[PDB]
Amino acid sequence: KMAFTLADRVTEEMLADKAALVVEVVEENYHDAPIVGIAVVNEHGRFFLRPETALADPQFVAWLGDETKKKSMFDSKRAAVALKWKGIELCGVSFDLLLAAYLLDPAQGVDDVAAAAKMKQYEAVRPDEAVYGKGAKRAVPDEPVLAEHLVRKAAAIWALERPFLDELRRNEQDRLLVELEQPLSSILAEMEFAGVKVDTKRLEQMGEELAEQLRTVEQRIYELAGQEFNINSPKQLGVILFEKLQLPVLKKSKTGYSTSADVLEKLAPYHEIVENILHYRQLGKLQSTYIEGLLKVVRPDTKKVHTIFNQALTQTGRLSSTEPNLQNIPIRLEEGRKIRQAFVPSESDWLIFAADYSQIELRVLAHIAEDDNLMEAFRRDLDIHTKTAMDIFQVSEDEVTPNMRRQAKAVNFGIVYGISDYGLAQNLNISRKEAAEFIERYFESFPGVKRYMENIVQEAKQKGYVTTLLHRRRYLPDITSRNFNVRSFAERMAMNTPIQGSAADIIKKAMIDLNARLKEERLQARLLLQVHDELILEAPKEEMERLCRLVPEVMEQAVTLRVPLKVDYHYGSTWYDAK
DNA sequence: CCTGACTCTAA
DNA sequence: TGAGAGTCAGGC
Ligand SMILES: [Mg+2]
């Protein structure tokens, strides 16, 4: 039973200039969510404060907002945002244990203080799940149990700062935490708090039109099946397709017959039901995920969505977005793309501005591999897909057919995402053998990329990990494995992580640089979203001309590589038009 | 109610 | 390739 004071007023000794601070928000989505308790651990002792006491106290609030009063926390964005919703600024967070643990080993899955603490053999803190329960049973416990938990977390943070900072420094990652991930966390908190405005009326009428289309196609499907069934059930659809209608089984899943879109495309010539099922799937995906899904998470009082960015989840250093996920809004097919008409500026006479890197991953690869051919291509700002086709097929530019370019683009995509030869075969509907031939032909044209791929797998084997441009790390113990599939995956991750992770590093740096530049230039423009290689802002219409120059330049100059970086940009009345 | 399987969307 | 989400179905 750890010693602490259950204070019922704030005292001067709670406001020391260095502390471990816990501002506890138990709800998974922390927007406008309750703070259930506060703990402070510092040189003078350990303290628990009730939030209705602490957050109405002027000296405590001034302390929270004083940048010169340093705090160590876990998941400081959660606390910062919950506080933003109460009109209180949190400053001076000089160490975030969540981001520290994430940098030290993203594969650990650290999502509470106890998981971080276990990495340094500190176990005097319970997992959050043990205290709050899980799922339906999730609940805030009685004050004594809650208070001891928060104080134990704060005490762990206080104890663990030094050993985490020492390891970060041995890894050359201390500047990564302090100059990149922590400042980024503040920027993301502002982006989430600002939110993106949604034209719910547009979304609703789209939903009405979709529902009408769904009803028509659903009926057509039952007619063609001679029967009603749940079209959304791959199992029931499987019985209709493969048993009642006797279509060939081209592919199986673990548990049954495949009904994936690519399989269905190949069955379309056998039966009219198939094209109708494909149409149903496309419409139903839009309706259920995009329209019903978005509408459910728009806040009714401001008509905004406030995503939460997970900065401490992916193995590559990429951001993730939830509730809603705004990184997978349709764009490829026009029907789906219209969804983006519903994302609008939050003020009148404002516009949406979007800026994206052009081929950042292959440009990073050019730089890291020093491949002379690939570097020359980007120095000439060539269409990289056409140029790759010309090299692999050994033809002139005017002999590149559309299919040749599509296949080259597929090879390039494979390189950017670290897909296997099986994956490539699958993506191009060709044999594994032919895919191996493509890949081999690629390495003959880009021998420096071949050399990089060989060298980085050996490096991963020797060191145990690979690193990105800004010193992010991914451990790959699977690389040795005697299981071929397990090992091959590890090798692909060794190849791909420095590409994808360096691209992540760059855009994170761009974000930091951009936020600083916007303030220096006294613009009202604000950052709303990041979608891997693009940044989405809204600004007064009078700022567009300046942003057209400023944003690409900041992004382009974020790092200096052996090849240029190139940023394209667009703006308009909705995210759709920012194209 | 919880969890795994299947499908689909983006980069 | 990574992630997030919706839906179903089996086990509870
Ligand atoms: Mg792009």
UniProtKB/TrEMBL annotation:
Ca(2+) 1 binds at D57. PROSITE patterns: DNA_POLYMERASE_A. Gene3D superfamilies: 3.30.70.370, 5' to 3' exonuclease, C-terminal subdomain, Ribonuclease H-like superfamily/Ribonuclease H, Taq DNA Polymerase, Chain T, domain 4. Residues 336-543 form the DNA-directed DNA polymerase family A palm domain. DGTP binds at Q359, R405, K409, F413. Its EC number is 2.7.7.7. Ca(2+) 2 binds at D533, E534. Residues 3-169 form the 3'-5' exonuclease domain. Keywords: Calcium, DNA damage, DNA repair, DNA replication, DNA-binding, DNA-directed DNA polymerase, Exonuclease, Hydrolase, Metal-binding, Nuclease, Nucleotide-binding, Nucleotidyltransferase, Transferase. Mg(2+) 2 binds at D356, D533. It catalyses: DNA(n) + a 2'-deoxyribonucleoside 5'-triphosphate = DNA(n+1) + diphosphate. Mg(2+) 3 binds at E361, D533. It holds the Pfam family DNA_polI_exo1. InterPro entries: 3'-5'_exonuclease_dom, DNA-dir_DNA_pol_A_CS, DNA-dir_DNA_pol_A_palm_dom, DNA/RNA_pol_sf, DNA_polI_exonuclease, DNA_polymerase_1, DNA_polymerase_A, RNaseH-like_sf. One of its GO terms (molecular function) is 3'-5' exonuclease activity. DCTP binds at R340, H532. GO terms for biological process: DNA-templated DNA replication; double-strand break repair. Ca(2+) 3 binds at L561. DTTP binds at Q359, H385, R405, K409, Y417, D533. DATP binds at I331, Y417. Mg(2+) 1 binds at D356, Y357, D533. Single-chain monomer with multiple functions. Belongs to the DNA polymerase type-A family. This is DNA polymerase I. It comes from Geobacillus stearothermophilus.
